[PDB]
């Protein structure tokens, strides 16, 4: 319903080099272990600055409040760690 | 974010025999043809009664206002037809 389009546009306006990855129950095919519907990891070393992470998180969650998206604003190292627990993801393209 | 849980619950409260199928960009992999983020087909021959289809549709869309879900309230014959144009779907357990 055009929300993903909006996510990519908001992200890219703030953090041009960020990469977006999708997971959660729909992508991973787990609808019975209580995953979020759609997890959205937004990944850049710009988020090494906690102030930028907070700024961006507040912007994106305000825009998408009470929605099925669960946002994770991560540095590259953090995303590398996150993948250890993720069955399958898709780079948003 | 537990919206799909809510869809199954609302649906099964009204129409016990309904089946729910997911498609759209996330399930199908296009991303690049403007598909809805998540299409949700809710399918039962109870919806042969237009008044029931209208009632249910009003209920479910009011609950999920301005969300990434696109709902399709369908009889079995209608869902058979829809599948001719769907690359991939998943039954929602």
Radius of gyration of chain A, in Å, reads 13 Å
Protein structure class of chain A = alpha+beta
Assembly state of the chains shown: homodimer
Helix-strand string of chain A: HEHEHEHE
> Biggest chain pair contact, residues each?
A-B, 21 and 22 residues
> How far apart, in Å, are the first and last alpha carbons of chain A?
16 Å
CATH topology description of chain A: Beta Polymerase, domain 2
Determine the fraction of residues in helical runs of chain A and give it as a percent range: 40-55%
Shape of chain A: globular
Strand content of chain A: 15-25%
User: If helices are DSSP runs of H or I spanning 4 or more residues, what is the number of helices of chain A?
Assistant: 4
Q: What would CATH call the class of chain A?
A: Alpha Beta
CATH homologous superfamily name of chain A? Beta Polymerase, domain 2
Q: Sheet with the most strands of chain A?
A: 4 strands, mixed
How many domains of chain A, as an integer?
1
Strand order of the largest sheet of chain A: 3-2-1-4
InterPro entries (chains A, B): NT_sf, Polymerase_NTP_transf_dom
Domain Polymerase nucleotidyl transferase (chains A, B): 4-92
GO molecular function (chains A, B): nucleotidyltransferase activity
Pfam families (chains A, B): NTP_transf_2
